[PDB]
Structures are given as structure tokens and as C-alpha cells.
């Protein structure tokens, strides 16, 4: 069902894994739970057309209360992209680089 309208917060710096997949821990600051977490990679912050691919299968925030946790993993493209969590003006982004 519906996406998460509130703001996220990285609770730890994203980290590269096995062959270049990045994992992300966030904390959600909204009371519209339950809701699907807006997670994706992107290269154009205007279009937010998904680059890469979200590896986490259907990430939904569980609780209906403020401050819940969540862990996501994505498959970023080669070179430079942006991790993009949340929607709107409260979007959070972190630059990513993947070599080979």
C-alpha cells in the first residue's frame, strides 16, 4: 500500500558489501504507519527515474509510532549515483560510487 510521507534519517553510513551492493539503515520519523518506504537509486534528482535496482523486497515500515528502524539494500550502477530515501522536500540522499 501507500508510500511513506515523512522524513527518514540514516542511522549509519551506507556500506559496500560482497560485490558492490550497498546496504542502508534508516530511521523513520512519521506516524503514517504502516507505509511503503520510498527507497531507490537515482542519477537525476529532478526525474527520480530509478537507476540501479532496489534489492530489498517490498520494504514497508511496520509501526504506527514515531521513530522506527528499517534496513534496505540496493544494487547501485557503476560509477556515481544517489541513494534516495523518502519523498518530497524531506528526501535524504547520500552519494555512492561503485568501481568494479
Amino acid at each position, epitope marked *: 500500500y501507500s508510500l511513506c510521507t*515523512a522524513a527518514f534519517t540514516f542511522t549509519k553510513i551506507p556500506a559496500e558489501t560482497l560485490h558492490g551492493t550497498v546496504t542502508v539503515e534508516v530511521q523513520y*520519523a512519521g506516524t503514517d504507519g504502516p507505509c511503503k518506504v520510498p527507497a531507490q537509486m537515482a542519477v537525476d534528482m529532478q526525474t527520480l527515474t530509478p537507476v540501479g535496482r532496489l534489492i530489498t523486497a517490498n520494504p514497508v515500515i511496520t509501526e504506527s509510532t514515531e521513530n522506527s528502524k528499517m534496513m534496505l539494500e540496493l544494487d547501485p550502477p557503476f560509477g556515481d549515483s544517489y541513494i534516495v530515501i523518502g519523498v518530497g*522536500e524531506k528526501k535524504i540522499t547520500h552519494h555512492w560510487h561503485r568501481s568494479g
Partner: antibody
Amino acid sequence: VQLLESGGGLVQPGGSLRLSCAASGFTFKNYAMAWVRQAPGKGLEWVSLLYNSEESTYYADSVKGRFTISRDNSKNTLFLQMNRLRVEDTAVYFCVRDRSNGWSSINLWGRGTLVTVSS
Amino acid sequence: DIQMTQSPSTLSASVGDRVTMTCRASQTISGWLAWYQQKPGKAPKLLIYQASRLESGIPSRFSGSGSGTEFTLTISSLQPDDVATYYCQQYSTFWTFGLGTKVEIKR
């Protein structure tokens, strides 16, 4: 940069009206759009919002099932299909662009189109 | 949902005076708050976003400040063009609008 609403007027209770808004001055496809109404002498009430997908469309409980919004990115046009109208739906309806991708400050407003659900 | 209360409901003051209105939210809305001016019959004009960021083109006399649960909009030197109602908007979770603060002018 402009929003222009049209389609409003007088509807019989239980009737149906289809509002539309014409966007200009920006990549309409990129921004979230919403309809915010204002009953006469009352406050602002957001009624519906949409960005891309089924998951990124929202409806205030007061119009759930009754209203529907639609996005025609080829024509840069927003629709609000309201059915089963009730007398208290009488209000001015503002077509509104979100700052970004949804649920932000509202930095582009229409002119208002007044829907009068009367009998 | 997050209820929003504004005060004062109405107020009259004089050209030059420092007007100050307040609004409180039923729970933490961080800094995700915006202020709108709406003269009758026209549409709202956003003035402030993120509690305290002045929108582009809005006059400098308008300011904002606040965090978490209580916020304040402050017109430093009232001007005849400011006769309007003033609404606040939270946007931490969905949207909620205040009921307004009507500013009348004393001459």
C-alpha cells in the same frame, strides 16, 4: 509558471463533477500535484495528492471512494473526478503543485474553482 | 492526524507595529512547517518554509522561527498590504492547516 483550474460550478447532491487543471512553466511530470479545497469561510483541507503510481496517490478520509485524481503527463493536466457529492463538498477547489515529489511546502497555487453542490 | 492550532484568531495593529502570531502542533513536526498569506478571494501565498526559510520574493519583514511543536511568524513592521488571514501548514506526516490569524490594520 502557472496553474489554471476549470470545470467547477453547480452540482446536484449525489451528482458528479470532473475538475481539471492546466500546468505550464515546469516539467509537470516531475512534481506531485494535489487538490486543496476551502469551504466558504472555513479553512484549507487537502483532498487528494498524486505523484506517479497507485502507491503515491492519497485521499483524505472525507472523500475516500467518492473522489479520484488523474494525471495526464502528455497534456500537463490534472483531473479530480468527484462523485456522490454531498452538500458540504461546497467549496473552492485549488489545484496545487508540491515543492518537489510530495508532502512539502506548497509553492504554486491555482486561482480556485468554486464547486457549489446545491439542490 | 496531527492537529494544528493558531493564535490569535484575529488581531488589529497599526502600520509600523511588530505583529507576532503563533501556532502549535499536536506532536513533533521537526522543522517541517510553512506559513501562508491569503487575502480574500485570492489564493494562498507561501511566505516561509521549514519553520524559518523565507520564500523567494517575500519581503524581509516576514520571518519565522520554531522547532518541534511551537512556531512563530513575525511581521517586523506592518504594512497596509498585509491585511490578510495567515495560515500555517505542517508537513511532517500528511498535511494539516491551521484555521488562521486574521490581521486587520489600525489607522
